[PDB]
Each structure stands twice: as C-alpha cells, then as structure tokens.
Design an enzyme around this catalytic site. Sequence first.
Site, PDB file in Angstrom:
ATOM      1  N   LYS A 190      37.691 -20.405  19.549  1.00 37.09           N
ATOM      2  CA  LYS A 190      38.659 -21.223  18.791  1.00 37.09           C
ATOM      3  C   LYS A 190      40.028 -20.685  18.986  1.00 37.09           C
TER       4      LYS A 190
ATOM      5  N   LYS B 197      47.014 -13.144  18.485  1.00 37.41           N
ATOM      6  CA  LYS B 197      47.168 -12.285  17.317  1.00 37.41           C
ATOM      7  C   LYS B 197      47.756 -13.055  16.140  1.00 37.41           C
TER       8      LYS B 197
ATOM      9  N   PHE C  27      43.912 -30.666  26.782  1.00 35.78           N
ATOM     10  CA  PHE C  27      42.647 -31.278  26.384  1.00 35.78           C
ATOM     11  C   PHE C  27      42.496 -32.801  26.453  1.00 35.78           C
ATOM     12  CE2 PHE C  27      44.684 -29.948  22.272  1.00 35.78           C
ATOM     13  CZ  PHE C  27      45.177 -31.191  21.952  1.00 35.78           C
TER      14      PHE C  27
END
Length: 124
Positions: A6, A76, A85
């Site tokens: 993810k 991070k 996508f």
Amino acid sequence: FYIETKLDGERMQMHKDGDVYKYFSRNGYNYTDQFGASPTELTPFIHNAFKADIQICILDGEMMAYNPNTQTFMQKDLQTCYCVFDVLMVNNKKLGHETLRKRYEILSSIFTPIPGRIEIVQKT
C-alpha cells in the site's frame, strides 16, 4: 509467492500529444513547470517509452519518489517517479465506458515502464 504494498503519493494526471505534454493536479493546477512540457525538459525521462501509434493520451496516476540504491519508494535527496494506475483517453479514444479491468489491461498497450521512473500499479 507474492508481497503487496500500500502506497500513496501526489495525485497527478498526464496529457500527451506528440512530444507536447501537460501536468494536472487533483484539484487541477498546472504542474507542467515541475515535471515538463517537452522531452528536452522533472520527467523529460519518461518521454520515450511509448508504443508507436500512441500519439495523444490521458493517463491517471500518482507521483512517487524512490531511492535508486535502495530500489524502493521513500514514503516515510532522490528521484521523481510516476506510478500510473489508469487511462481515460488515448489516440482520440476516450473510453470511460470500459471497466477499469479494461483500462488497466489497455495500459500495457500505451507504453512500457522504466522502473524507478514511471512504473505501473493497481488502484484496487
């Protein structure tokens, strides 16, 4: 076996017409000054990986930064990569009627990736 990941980044759109391209944010905004409007000018790079008869194209995706020596996306200094996508219009053809199944599959048709600069991903 397989590992899934993810991730999230800055949602952007790319318009392509034959060496001239445009960059639109979520809200819409012209980010063409960040990435670039032609191959000579943060992702000139991506310019040539495109299949042949593709001349005009719209491609939905999200913009990521990755670390080359570590080959991973920092979530991070480093390099800019566009994880694409979806596709909306290409070569005159705007198909939002086709299921996302179809548009992802078609995505293979548009380009070929460079890893670490413009990969391809699933919206799932």
